[PDB]
Amino acid sequence: HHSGLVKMSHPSGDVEACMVQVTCGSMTLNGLWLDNTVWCPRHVMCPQLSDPNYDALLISMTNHSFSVQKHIANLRVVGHAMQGTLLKLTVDVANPSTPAYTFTTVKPGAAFSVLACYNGRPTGTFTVVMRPNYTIKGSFLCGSCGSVGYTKEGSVINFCYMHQMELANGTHTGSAFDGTMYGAFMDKQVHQVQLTDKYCSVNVVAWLYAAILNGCAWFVKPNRTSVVSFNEWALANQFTEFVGTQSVDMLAVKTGVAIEQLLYAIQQLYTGFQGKQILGSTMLEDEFTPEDVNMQIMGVV
Amino acid sequence: HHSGLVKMSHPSGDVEACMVQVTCGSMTLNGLWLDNTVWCPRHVMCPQLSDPNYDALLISMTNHSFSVQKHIANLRVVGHAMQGTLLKLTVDVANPSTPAYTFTTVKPGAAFSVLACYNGRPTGTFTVVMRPNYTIKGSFLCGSCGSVGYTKEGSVINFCYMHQMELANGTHTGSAFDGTMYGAFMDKQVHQVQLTDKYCSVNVVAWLYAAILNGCAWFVKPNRTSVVSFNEWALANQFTEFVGTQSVDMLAVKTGVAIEQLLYAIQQLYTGFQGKQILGSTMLEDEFTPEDVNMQIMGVV
Protein backbone atom coordinates (compact mmCIF):
# COMPACT_ATOMS: atom_id res chain seq x y z
CA HIS A 1 0.00 0.00 0.00
CA HIS A 2 1.32 3.41 -1.02
CA SER A 3 1.06 6.16 1.58
CA GLY A 4 0.36 9.21 -0.56
CA LEU A 5 3.58 10.78 0.77
CA VAL A 6 6.22 12.16 -1.59
CA LYS A 7 9.01 14.67 -1.26
CA MET A 8 7.06 17.65 -2.53
CA SER A 9 8.44 21.11 -3.31
CA HIS A 10 6.73 24.39 -3.86
CA PRO A 11 6.34 25.43 -7.47
CA SER A 12 9.55 27.26 -8.34
CA GLY A 13 8.13 29.82 -10.78
CA ASP A 14 8.20 32.92 -8.62
CA VAL A 15 11.79 32.28 -7.51
CA GLU A 16 13.11 31.34 -10.98
CA ALA A 17 12.23 34.91 -12.01
CA CYS A 18 14.63 36.16 -9.28
CA MET A 19 17.80 34.20 -10.19
CA VAL A 20 20.80 35.89 -11.81
CA GLN A 21 24.44 35.10 -12.50
CA VAL A 22 27.16 37.00 -10.58
CA THR A 23 30.74 37.02 -11.82
CA CYS A 24 33.67 38.74 -10.08
CA GLY A 25 36.88 37.99 -11.97
CA SER A 26 37.57 34.24 -12.13
CA MET A 27 34.58 33.12 -10.06
CA THR A 28 30.97 32.77 -11.18
CA LEU A 29 27.94 31.76 -9.13
CA ASN A 30 24.24 32.49 -8.56
CA GLY A 31 22.53 35.45 -6.99
CA LEU A 32 19.04 36.35 -5.85
CA TRP A 33 17.63 39.55 -7.30
CA LEU A 34 14.87 41.23 -5.31
CA ASP A 35 13.91 44.92 -5.64
CA ASN A 36 17.24 46.76 -6.34
CA THR A 37 19.36 44.25 -4.37
CA VAL A 38 21.31 41.18 -5.55
CA TRP A 39 22.39 38.75 -2.82
CA CYS A 40 25.17 36.24 -3.40
CA PRO A 41 27.85 34.36 -1.46
CA ARG A 42 30.86 36.42 -0.65
CA HIS A 43 33.45 33.90 -1.79
CA VAL A 44 32.69 35.05 -5.30
CA MET A 45 35.25 37.75 -4.44
CA CYS A 46 37.94 35.16 -3.79
CA PRO A 47 40.49 33.75 -6.30
CA GLN A 48 43.15 30.21 -3.03
CA LEU A 49 39.89 30.12 -0.99
CA SER A 50 41.52 28.94 2.29
CA ASP A 51 41.83 31.52 5.09
CA PRO A 52 40.92 34.46 2.81
CA ASN A 53 40.45 38.00 4.10
CA TYR A 54 37.00 39.01 2.93
CA ASP A 55 37.33 42.39 4.61
CA ALA A 56 40.42 43.16 2.53
CA LEU A 57 38.83 41.58 -0.56
CA LEU A 58 35.72 43.70 -0.05
CA ILE A 59 37.65 46.98 0.03
CA SER A 60 39.72 45.89 -2.96
CA MET A 61 36.44 45.86 -4.93
CA THR A 62 34.60 48.65 -6.69
CA ASN A 63 31.15 48.57 -8.25
CA HIS A 64 32.77 47.64 -11.59
CA SER A 65 34.30 44.51 -10.08
CA PHE A 66 30.85 42.83 -10.21
CA SER A 67 28.98 41.62 -13.29
CA VAL A 68 25.33 40.49 -12.98
CA GLN A 69 23.44 38.88 -15.87
CA LYS A 70 19.85 37.73 -16.03
CA HIS A 71 19.45 34.78 -18.43
CA ILE A 72 15.96 33.48 -17.53
CA ALA A 73 19.68 41.24 -19.30
CA ASN A 74 22.61 42.98 -17.63
CA LEU A 75 22.25 44.80 -14.32
CA ARG A 76 24.48 47.76 -13.53
CA VAL A 77 25.97 47.51 -10.03
CA VAL A 78 25.68 50.81 -8.17
CA GLY A 79 26.43 49.53 -4.68
CA HIS A 80 28.20 46.81 -2.81
CA ALA A 81 28.30 45.76 0.81
CA MET A 82 29.06 42.63 2.83
CA GLN A 83 26.79 41.11 5.51
CA GLY A 84 28.28 38.09 7.19
CA THR A 85 28.88 35.54 4.45
CA LEU A 86 26.83 37.34 1.80
CA LEU A 87 27.33 40.23 -0.54
CA LYS A 88 24.53 42.70 -0.92
CA LEU A 89 24.89 44.30 -4.36
CA THR A 90 22.70 47.24 -5.32
CA VAL A 91 21.74 47.46 -8.99
CA ASP A 92 20.18 50.27 -10.98
CA VAL A 93 16.98 48.44 -11.95
CA ALA A 94 14.49 46.81 -9.61
CA ASN A 95 13.33 43.28 -10.45
CA PRO A 96 9.77 43.76 -11.82
CA SER A 97 9.10 40.11 -11.03
CA THR A 98 9.93 40.61 -7.37
CA PRO A 99 7.54 38.47 -5.29
CA ALA A 100 6.03 39.37 -2.01
CA TYR A 101 8.72 38.05 0.30
CA THR A 102 10.30 37.83 3.71
CA PHE A 103 13.53 36.45 5.07
CA THR A 104 13.51 33.85 7.76
CA THR A 105 15.55 31.22 9.59
CA VAL A 106 14.61 27.58 9.37
CA LYS A 107 14.91 25.29 12.33
CA PRO A 108 16.01 21.69 12.66
CA GLY A 109 13.30 19.36 11.43
CA ALA A 110 11.67 22.03 9.29
CA ALA A 111 11.30 21.42 5.55
CA PHE A 112 12.01 23.75 2.70
CA SER A 113 12.28 23.88 -1.06
CA VAL A 114 15.56 24.45 -2.89
CA LEU A 115 15.93 25.80 -6.40
CA ALA A 116 19.27 24.49 -7.66
CA CYS A 117 20.92 26.70 -10.29
CA TYR A 118 24.12 26.83 -12.40
CA ASN A 119 25.34 30.00 -14.09
CA GLY A 120 22.14 31.70 -13.00
CA ARG A 121 20.05 29.13 -14.85
CA PRO A 122 17.48 27.19 -12.78
CA THR A 123 18.03 23.48 -13.25
CA GLY A 124 16.20 21.49 -10.59
CA THR A 125 14.03 21.70 -7.48
CA PHE A 126 13.97 19.46 -4.41
CA THR A 127 12.97 19.60 -0.76
CA VAL A 128 14.97 18.96 2.38
CA VAL A 129 14.71 19.08 6.15
CA MET A 130 17.30 21.08 8.07
CA ARG A 131 19.12 18.43 10.02
CA PRO A 132 19.90 18.75 13.74
CA ASN A 133 23.60 19.44 12.94
CA TYR A 134 22.51 22.26 10.59
CA THR A 135 23.36 20.52 7.34
CA ILE A 136 21.05 19.38 4.54
CA LYS A 137 21.09 16.23 2.43
CA GLY A 138 20.93 18.03 -0.86
CA SER A 139 22.23 17.58 -4.41
CA PHE A 140 24.69 20.32 -5.28
CA LEU A 141 27.66 20.45 -7.67
CA CYS A 142 30.44 22.90 -8.47
CA GLY A 143 28.84 26.14 -9.55
CA SER A 144 25.68 25.61 -7.44
CA CYS A 145 26.61 28.21 -4.78
CA GLY A 146 24.01 30.90 -4.51
CA SER A 147 21.08 28.55 -5.07
CA VAL A 148 18.29 29.43 -2.65
CA GLY A 149 15.95 27.61 -0.34
CA TYR A 150 12.61 29.04 0.68
CA THR A 151 9.24 28.29 2.21
CA LYS A 152 5.93 29.77 1.08
CA GLU A 153 2.99 31.13 3.08
CA GLY A 154 0.13 32.04 0.79
CA SER A 155 1.65 34.14 -1.94
CA VAL A 156 4.62 35.23 0.26
CA ILE A 157 8.00 33.62 -0.26
CA ASN A 158 10.13 33.14 2.88
CA PHE A 159 13.75 32.95 1.78
CA CYS A 160 15.74 30.95 4.31
CA TYR A 161 18.90 29.57 2.68
CA MET A 162 21.66 30.51 0.28
CA HIS A 163 23.90 27.62 -0.61
CA GLN A 164 27.65 27.75 0.30
CA MET A 165 29.33 24.41 0.79
CA GLU A 166 29.66 20.65 0.76
CA LEU A 167 31.03 18.94 3.84
CA ALA A 168 33.19 15.83 3.77
CA ASN A 169 30.26 13.52 4.51
CA GLY A 170 28.48 14.74 1.37
CA THR A 171 25.92 16.98 3.08
CA HIS A 172 25.58 20.69 2.47
CA THR A 173 25.22 23.95 4.30
CA GLY A 174 24.75 27.59 3.54
CA SER A 175 23.65 30.77 5.21
CA ALA A 176 20.53 32.62 6.21
CA PHE A 177 19.89 36.01 4.67
CA ASP A 178 21.17 37.76 7.73
CA GLY A 179 24.52 36.39 6.49
CA THR A 180 25.02 33.93 9.35
CA MET A 181 25.92 30.37 8.42
CA TYR A 182 23.69 27.60 9.69
CA GLY A 183 25.53 25.77 12.41
CA ALA A 184 29.11 26.53 13.42
CA PHE A 185 30.39 26.40 9.87
CA MET A 186 32.61 28.91 8.10
CA ASP A 187 32.83 29.79 4.40
CA LYS A 188 36.51 28.95 3.98
CA GLN A 189 38.02 25.95 2.23
CA VAL A 190 39.26 24.48 5.53
CA HIS A 191 38.65 21.33 7.56
CA GLN A 192 35.62 21.70 9.80
CA VAL A 193 34.19 19.36 12.42
CA GLN A 194 30.65 18.33 11.54
CA LEU A 195 28.43 17.81 14.52
CA THR A 196 26.47 14.65 15.06
CA ASP A 197 23.12 14.25 13.43
CA LYS A 198 20.08 13.05 15.39
CA TYR A 199 16.75 11.55 14.43
CA CYS A 200 14.09 14.28 14.38
CA SER A 201 11.52 12.90 16.84
CA VAL A 202 8.67 15.17 15.90
CA ASN A 203 9.09 13.94 12.29
CA VAL A 204 9.34 10.26 13.17
CA VAL A 205 6.05 10.78 15.03
CA ALA A 206 4.53 12.45 12.00
CA TRP A 207 5.55 9.41 9.96
CA LEU A 208 4.08 6.84 12.34
CA TYR A 209 0.90 8.83 12.16
CA ALA A 210 1.05 8.66 8.34
CA ALA A 211 1.31 4.90 8.55
CA ILE A 212 -1.80 4.91 10.77
CA LEU A 213 -3.68 7.08 8.31
CA ASN A 214 -2.87 4.39 5.73
CA GLY A 215 -4.07 1.41 7.79
CA CYS A 216 -0.64 0.40 9.13
CA ALA A 217 -0.75 0.32 12.91
CA TRP A 218 0.70 -2.94 14.25
CA PHE A 219 3.22 -0.88 16.25
CA VAL A 220 0.54 0.92 18.27
CA LYS A 221 0.21 -0.54 21.75
CA PRO A 222 -1.80 0.87 24.66
CA ASN A 223 1.48 1.65 26.44
CA ARG A 224 2.73 5.19 26.75
CA THR A 225 5.79 7.26 27.45
CA SER A 226 5.54 10.82 28.69
CA VAL A 227 7.19 13.54 26.64
CA VAL A 228 9.49 14.24 29.56
CA SER A 229 10.39 10.61 30.00
CA PHE A 230 10.91 10.29 26.25
CA ASN A 231 13.03 13.43 26.08
CA GLU A 232 15.36 11.99 28.66
CA TRP A 233 15.49 8.79 26.59
CA ALA A 234 16.21 10.81 23.48
CA LEU A 235 19.25 12.56 24.89
CA ALA A 236 20.92 9.19 25.41
CA ASN A 237 19.91 7.82 21.99
CA GLN A 238 20.68 10.33 19.20
CA PHE A 239 17.06 11.48 18.95
CA THR A 240 16.06 15.10 19.29
CA GLU A 241 13.90 16.05 22.19
CA PHE A 242 10.26 16.16 21.12
CA VAL A 243 8.17 19.34 21.19
CA GLY A 244 4.55 18.98 20.17
CA THR A 245 2.71 21.35 17.83
CA GLN A 246 -0.87 22.01 16.84
CA SER A 247 -0.10 20.17 13.61
CA VAL A 248 0.91 17.06 15.54
CA ASP A 249 -2.19 17.62 17.65
CA MET A 250 -4.48 17.44 14.58
CA LEU A 251 -2.95 14.10 13.71
CA ALA A 252 -3.57 12.75 17.20
CA VAL A 253 -7.18 13.90 16.92
CA LYS A 254 -7.84 12.53 13.43
CA THR A 255 -6.47 9.08 14.30
CA GLY A 256 -7.28 8.82 17.96
CA VAL A 257 -3.73 7.77 18.82
CA ALA A 258 -1.92 9.71 21.54
CA ILE A 259 1.50 11.23 21.04
CA GLU A 260 2.62 9.28 24.05
CA GLN A 261 1.57 5.97 22.46
CA LEU A 262 3.93 6.63 19.53
CA LEU A 263 6.74 7.97 21.72
CA TYR A 264 6.71 4.55 23.38
CA ALA A 265 6.56 2.93 19.93
CA ILE A 266 9.65 4.84 18.79
CA GLN A 267 11.43 3.57 21.89
CA GLN A 268 10.71 -0.06 20.93
CA LEU A 269 11.19 0.29 17.16
CA TYR A 270 14.60 1.97 17.66
CA THR A 271 16.02 -1.35 18.89
CA GLY A 272 14.51 -3.35 16.04
CA PHE A 273 11.53 -3.62 13.72
CA GLN A 274 11.64 -7.43 14.11
CA GLY A 275 11.45 -8.06 10.38
CA LYS A 276 8.30 -5.95 9.93
CA GLN A 277 7.76 -3.05 7.58
CA ILE A 278 6.36 0.42 8.18
CA LEU A 279 5.13 2.15 5.01
CA GLY A 280 7.58 0.06 3.05
CA SER A 281 10.57 0.99 5.20
CA THR A 282 12.32 -0.98 7.89
CA MET A 283 13.93 2.00 9.63
CA LEU A 284 12.43 5.08 11.19
CA GLU A 285 11.79 7.92 8.73
CA ASP A 286 12.21 11.53 9.85
CA GLU A 287 12.20 13.39 6.52
CA PHE A 288 8.50 14.19 6.55
CA THR A 289 7.00 16.82 8.83
CA PRO A 290 3.62 16.95 10.60
CA GLU A 291 2.61 19.65 8.13
CA ASP A 292 3.59 17.49 5.15
CA VAL A 293 1.40 14.71 6.50
CA ASN A 294 -1.47 17.07 7.25
CA MET A 295 -1.37 18.61 3.80
CA GLN A 296 -0.61 15.66 1.54
CA ILE A 297 -2.78 13.01 3.18
CA MET A 298 -5.61 15.20 4.60
CA GLY A 299 -5.78 18.49 2.67
CA VAL A 300 -5.05 20.55 5.81
CA VAL A 301 -2.83 23.64 5.71
CA HIS B 1 27.85 9.30 4.11
CA HIS B 2 25.25 11.10 2.01
CA SER B 3 25.07 10.12 -1.65
CA GLY B 4 24.22 13.41 -3.31
CA LEU B 5 21.01 11.82 -4.63
CA VAL B 6 17.62 13.46 -4.08
CA LYS B 7 14.27 13.25 -5.78
CA MET B 8 14.76 16.22 -8.08
CA SER B 9 12.14 17.82 -10.33
CA HIS B 10 12.45 20.21 -13.18
CA PRO B 11 11.70 23.82 -12.36
CA SER B 12 7.95 24.19 -12.81
CA GLY B 13 7.86 27.79 -14.06
CA ASP B 14 7.17 27.21 -17.73
CA VAL B 15 4.34 24.77 -16.99
CA GLU B 16 2.74 26.86 -14.21
CA ALA B 17 2.09 29.50 -16.89
CA CYS B 18 0.03 26.87 -18.80
CA MET B 19 -2.38 25.74 -16.05
CA VAL B 20 -6.05 26.76 -16.04
CA GLN B 21 -9.25 25.77 -14.29
CA VAL B 22 -12.00 23.98 -16.27
CA THR B 23 -15.54 23.79 -14.94
CA CYS B 24 -18.46 22.02 -16.63
CA GLY B 25 -21.52 22.19 -14.40
CA SER B 26 -20.89 20.56 -11.02
CA MET B 27 -17.34 19.39 -11.72
CA THR B 28 -14.15 21.43 -11.61
CA LEU B 29 -10.60 20.34 -12.40
CA ASN B 30 -7.35 21.44 -14.07
CA GLY B 31 -6.48 21.92 -17.70
CA LEU B 32 -3.36 22.53 -19.75
CA TRP B 33 -3.48 25.55 -22.02
CA LEU B 34 -1.12 25.51 -24.99
CA ASP B 35 -1.59 27.63 -28.14
CA ASN B 36 -5.42 27.82 -28.67
CA THR B 37 -6.09 24.40 -27.08
CA VAL B 38 -7.05 23.46 -23.50
CA TRP B 39 -6.63 19.79 -22.57
CA CYS B 40 -8.42 18.29 -19.59
CA PRO B 41 -9.82 14.95 -18.40
CA ARG B 42 -13.12 14.08 -19.93
CA HIS B 43 -14.85 13.11 -16.69
CA VAL B 44 -15.29 16.81 -16.09
CA MET B 45 -18.39 16.31 -18.26
CA CYS B 46 -19.82 13.76 -15.84
CA PRO B 47 -22.18 14.42 -12.88
CA GLN B 48 -22.71 9.30 -10.95
CA LEU B 49 -19.28 8.66 -12.57
CA SER B 50 -19.69 4.85 -12.85
CA ASP B 51 -20.27 3.43 -16.35
CA PRO B 52 -20.94 6.88 -17.89
CA ASN B 53 -21.47 7.39 -21.61
CA TYR B 54 -18.90 9.99 -22.60
CA ASP B 55 -20.02 9.84 -26.22
CA ALA B 56 -23.54 10.84 -25.20
CA LEU B 57 -22.18 13.36 -22.68
CA LEU B 58 -19.97 14.87 -25.35
CA ILE B 59 -22.85 15.48 -27.77
CA SER B 60 -24.98 16.84 -24.95
CA MET B 61 -22.38 19.62 -24.62
CA THR B 62 -22.02 22.88 -26.49
CA ASN B 63 -19.17 25.37 -26.37
CA HIS B 64 -21.02 27.25 -23.60
CA SER B 65 -21.03 24.16 -21.38
CA PHE B 66 -17.32 24.77 -20.61
CA SER B 67 -15.82 27.53 -18.46
CA VAL B 68 -12.03 28.06 -18.41
CA GLN B 69 -10.35 30.50 -16.02
CA LYS B 70 -6.69 31.40 -15.71
CA HIS B 71 -5.80 32.36 -12.12
CA ILE B 72 -1.97 32.28 -12.19
CA ALA B 73 -8.42 35.66 -17.10
CA ASN B 74 -11.36 33.95 -18.79
CA LEU B 75 -10.98 32.03 -22.03
CA ARG B 76 -13.88 31.80 -24.46
CA VAL B 77 -14.43 28.23 -25.67
CA VAL B 78 -14.92 28.10 -29.43
CA GLY B 79 -14.44 24.38 -29.92
CA HIS B 80 -14.73 21.07 -28.18
CA ALA B 81 -13.71 17.55 -29.06
CA MET B 82 -12.90 14.30 -27.25
CA GLN B 83 -9.74 12.20 -27.77
CA GLY B 84 -9.72 9.03 -25.74
CA THR B 85 -9.95 10.09 -22.10
CA LEU B 86 -9.25 13.78 -22.75
CA LEU B 87 -11.19 16.76 -23.92
CA LYS B 88 -9.56 19.06 -26.41
CA LEU B 89 -11.16 22.50 -25.98
CA THR B 90 -10.37 25.27 -28.44
CA VAL B 91 -10.33 28.79 -27.01
CA ASP B 92 -10.29 32.16 -28.72
CA VAL B 93 -6.92 33.34 -27.36
CA ALA B 94 -3.59 31.56 -27.66
CA ASN B 95 -1.49 31.23 -24.51
CA PRO B 96 1.32 33.81 -24.98
CA SER B 97 3.36 31.88 -22.42
CA THR B 98 3.19 28.70 -24.48
CA PRO B 99 6.54 26.89 -24.20
CA ALA B 100 8.30 25.02 -26.89
CA TYR B 101 6.77 21.60 -26.36
CA THR B 102 6.11 18.08 -27.53
CA PHE B 103 3.90 15.26 -26.37
CA THR B 104 5.39 11.92 -25.51
CA THR B 105 4.81 8.60 -23.76
CA VAL B 106 6.88 7.62 -20.78
CA LYS B 107 8.01 4.07 -20.24
CA PRO B 108 8.32 1.95 -17.13
CA GLY B 109 11.35 2.97 -15.13
CA ALA B 110 11.47 6.44 -16.66
CA ALA B 111 11.25 9.47 -14.37
CA PHE B 112 9.20 12.59 -14.79
CA SER B 113 8.13 15.71 -12.98
CA VAL B 114 4.55 16.36 -11.88
CA LEU B 115 3.02 19.75 -11.21
CA ALA B 116 0.15 19.13 -8.79
CA CYS B 117 -2.66 21.68 -9.01
CA TYR B 118 -6.07 22.40 -7.42
CA ASN B 119 -8.64 24.71 -9.01
CA GLY B 120 -6.08 25.59 -11.64
CA ARG B 121 -3.65 26.82 -8.99
CA PRO B 122 -0.20 25.17 -8.91
CA THR B 123 0.48 23.86 -5.43
CA GLY B 124 3.40 21.43 -5.45
CA THR B 125 5.95 19.63 -7.60
CA PHE B 126 7.42 16.16 -7.25
CA THR B 127 9.04 13.47 -9.38
CA VAL B 128 8.08 9.87 -9.97
CA VAL B 129 9.06 6.83 -11.98
CA MET B 130 6.39 5.13 -14.09
CA ARG B 131 6.05 1.77 -12.44
CA PRO B 132 6.00 -1.52 -14.38
CA ASN B 133 2.21 -1.84 -13.81
CA TYR B 134 1.75 1.68 -15.25
CA THR B 135 0.89 3.42 -12.00
CA ILE B 136 2.82 6.12 -10.13
CA LYS B 137 3.44 6.59 -6.42
CA GLY B 138 2.28 10.16 -6.35
CA SER B 139 0.51 12.53 -3.95
CA PHE B 140 -2.87 13.53 -5.32
CA LEU B 141 -6.13 14.58 -3.64
CA CYS B 142 -9.69 15.29 -4.73
CA GLY B 143 -9.56 18.09 -7.27
CA SER B 144 -6.05 17.18 -8.52
CA CYS B 145 -7.25 15.67 -11.84
CA GLY B 146 -5.75 17.45 -14.77
CA SER B 147 -2.37 17.97 -13.12
CA VAL B 148 0.38 17.25 -15.64
CA GLY B 149 3.63 15.36 -15.73
CA TYR B 150 6.40 16.25 -18.13
CA THR B 151 10.06 15.82 -18.95
CA LYS B 152 12.35 18.52 -20.33
CA GLU B 153 14.98 18.40 -23.07
CA GLY B 154 16.81 21.69 -23.30
CA SER B 155 14.13 24.33 -23.41
CA VAL B 156 11.49 21.90 -24.80
CA ILE B 157 8.85 20.51 -22.49
CA ASN B 158 7.71 16.93 -23.19
CA PHE B 159 4.24 16.52 -21.74
CA CYS B 160 3.63 12.88 -20.88
CA TYR B 161 0.88 12.60 -18.26
CA MET B 162 -2.47 14.06 -17.30
CA HIS B 163 -3.71 12.85 -13.95
CA GLN B 164 -6.99 10.83 -13.74
CA MET B 165 -7.28 8.47 -10.81
CA GLU B 166 -6.28 6.85 -7.55
CA LEU B 167 -6.30 3.07 -7.35
CA ALA B 168 -7.22 1.12 -4.24
CA ASN B 169 -3.59 0.55 -3.26
CA GLY B 170 -3.03 4.32 -3.11
CA THR B 171 -1.10 4.68 -6.37
CA HIS B 172 -2.21 6.83 -9.27
CA THR B 173 -2.63 6.75 -13.01
CA GLY B 174 -3.61 9.04 -15.81
CA SER B 175 -3.36 9.32 -19.54
CA ALA B 176 -0.93 10.30 -22.25
CA PHE B 177 -1.84 13.22 -24.48
CA ASP B 178 -2.99 10.90 -27.20
CA GLY B 179 -5.83 10.23 -24.74
CA THR B 180 -4.85 6.63 -23.97
CA MET B 181 -4.63 5.65 -20.32
CA TYR B 182 -1.37 4.21 -19.07
CA GLY B 183 -1.86 0.53 -18.49
CA ALA B 184 -5.19 -1.25 -18.89
CA PHE B 185 -7.05 1.26 -16.75
CA MET B 186 -10.32 3.01 -17.54
CA ASP B 187 -11.59 6.42 -16.41
CA LYS B 188 -14.75 5.15 -14.74
CA GLN B 189 -15.46 4.88 -11.02
CA VAL B 190 -15.40 1.07 -11.15
CA HIS B 191 -13.33 -1.72 -9.62
CA GLN B 192 -10.22 -2.42 -11.67
CA VAL B 193 -7.56 -5.09 -11.28
CA GLN B 194 -4.15 -3.55 -10.71
CA LEU B 195 -1.32 -5.51 -12.21
CA THR B 196 1.68 -6.58 -10.21
CA ASP B 197 4.55 -4.20 -9.76
CA LYS B 198 8.14 -5.30 -10.34
CA TYR B 199 11.52 -3.95 -9.29
CA CYS B 200 13.00 -1.87 -12.13
CA SER B 201 16.33 -3.63 -12.71
CA VAL B 202 17.96 -0.91 -14.76
CA ASN B 203 17.26 1.48 -11.85
CA VAL B 204 18.48 -0.85 -9.12
CA VAL B 205 21.70 -1.07 -11.16
CA ALA B 206 21.88 2.69 -11.39
CA TRP B 207 21.58 2.82 -7.60
CA LEU B 208 24.30 0.27 -6.91
CA TYR B 209 26.49 2.33 -9.16
CA ALA B 210 25.62 5.43 -7.11
CA ALA B 211 26.72 3.64 -3.98
CA ILE B 212 30.03 2.84 -5.73
CA LEU B 213 30.48 6.45 -6.73
CA ASN B 214 30.14 7.25 -3.02
CA GLY B 215 32.70 4.70 -1.77
CA CYS B 216 30.19 1.97 -0.87
CA ALA B 217 31.10 -1.21 -2.69
CA TRP B 218 31.18 -4.18 -0.30
CA PHE B 219 28.57 -5.90 -2.50
CA VAL B 220 30.82 -5.94 -5.58
CA LYS B 221 32.35 -9.36 -6.13
CA PRO B 222 34.30 -10.55 -9.18
CA ASN B 223 31.40 -12.86 -10.03
CA ARG B 224 29.10 -12.11 -12.91
CA THR B 225 25.72 -12.92 -14.38
CA SER B 226 24.98 -12.41 -18.05
CA VAL B 227 22.11 -10.14 -18.99
CA VAL B 228 20.36 -13.11 -20.55
CA SER B 229 20.89 -15.28 -17.51
CA PHE B 230 19.74 -12.43 -15.28
CA ASN B 231 16.69 -11.74 -17.41
CA GLU B 232 15.58 -15.31 -16.98
CA TRP B 233 16.14 -14.92 -13.23
CA ALA B 234 14.14 -11.71 -13.25
CA LEU B 235 11.05 -13.24 -14.79
CA ALA B 236 10.79 -15.63 -11.86
CA ASN B 237 11.48 -12.96 -9.23
CA GLN B 238 9.33 -9.83 -9.81
CA PHE B 239 12.19 -7.91 -11.41
CA THR B 240 11.93 -6.36 -14.84
CA GLU B 241 14.18 -7.68 -17.52
CA PHE B 242 17.24 -5.48 -17.84
CA VAL B 243 18.07 -3.51 -21.00
CA GLY B 244 21.30 -1.54 -20.93
CA THR B 245 21.68 2.04 -22.17
CA GLN B 246 24.52 4.39 -22.98
CA SER B 247 23.79 6.09 -19.66
CA VAL B 248 24.33 2.84 -17.78
CA ASP B 249 27.41 2.37 -19.94
CA MET B 250 28.94 5.67 -18.75
CA LEU B 251 28.51 4.51 -15.18
CA ALA B 252 30.26 1.23 -15.89
CA VAL B 253 33.11 3.18 -17.47
CA LYS B 254 33.47 5.79 -14.73
CA THR B 255 33.59 3.18 -11.96
CA GLY B 256 35.18 0.26 -13.71
CA VAL B 257 32.47 -2.12 -12.52
CA ALA B 258 30.71 -4.25 -15.12
CA ILE B 259 26.95 -4.39 -15.45
CA GLU B 260 27.23 -8.12 -15.06
CA GLN B 261 29.00 -7.76 -11.69
CA LEU B 262 26.01 -5.84 -10.32
CA LEU B 263 23.43 -8.11 -11.95
CA TYR B 264 24.98 -10.90 -9.89
CA ALA B 265 24.96 -8.60 -6.85
CA ILE B 266 21.23 -7.93 -7.26
CA GLN B 267 20.69 -11.68 -7.35
CA GLN B 268 22.41 -12.10 -3.96
CA LEU B 269 21.06 -8.95 -2.29
CA TYR B 270 17.46 -9.85 -3.25
CA THR B 271 17.57 -12.75 -0.76
CA GLY B 272 19.05 -10.63 2.02
CA PHE B 273 21.39 -7.76 2.78
CA GLN B 274 22.69 -9.69 5.83
CA GLY B 275 22.30 -6.72 8.16
CA LYS B 276 24.37 -4.39 5.95
CA GLN B 277 23.37 -1.03 4.55
CA ILE B 278 23.58 0.36 1.04
CA LEU B 279 23.44 4.18 0.88
CA GLY B 280 21.52 4.13 4.13
CA SER B 281 18.91 1.66 2.89
CA THR B 282 18.55 -2.02 3.60
CA MET B 283 16.41 -2.83 0.56
CA LEU B 284 17.03 -2.37 -3.13
CA GLU B 285 16.13 1.09 -4.44
CA ASP B 286 14.72 1.48 -7.96
CA GLU B 287 13.40 5.05 -7.88
CA PHE B 288 16.52 6.63 -9.34
CA THR B 289 17.46 6.30 -13.00
CA PRO B 290 20.87 6.03 -14.68
CA GLU B 291 20.35 9.57 -15.95
CA ASP B 292 19.58 10.86 -12.45
CA VAL B 293 22.83 9.34 -11.23
CA ASN B 294 24.79 10.67 -14.18
CA MET B 295 23.45 14.18 -13.76
CA GLN B 296 23.31 14.62 -10.00
CA ILE B 297 26.55 12.90 -9.02
CA MET B 298 28.67 13.58 -12.15
CA GLY B 299 27.30 16.61 -14.01
CA VAL B 300 26.56 14.54 -17.16
CA VAL B 301 23.44 15.13 -19.26
Automatic annotation (TrEMBL), chains A, B:
Source organism, top-level taxon: Viruses
Interval of the full protein contained in this chain: 3248 to 3551 of 4391
Compartment list: Host cytoplasm, Host perinuclear region; Host membrane
Domain named Peptidase C30: residues: 3-301
Gene designation: orf1a
Name this polypeptide is given: Orf1a protein
Organism lineage: Viruses, Riboviria, Orthornavirae, Pisuviricota, Pisoniviricetes
Family that this chain belongs to: Belongs to the coronaviruses polyprotein 1ab family.
Signal peptide: none
Function: Plays a role in the initial induction of autophagosomes from host endoplasmic reticulum. Later, limits the expansion of these phagosomes that are no longer able to deliver viral components to lysosomes.
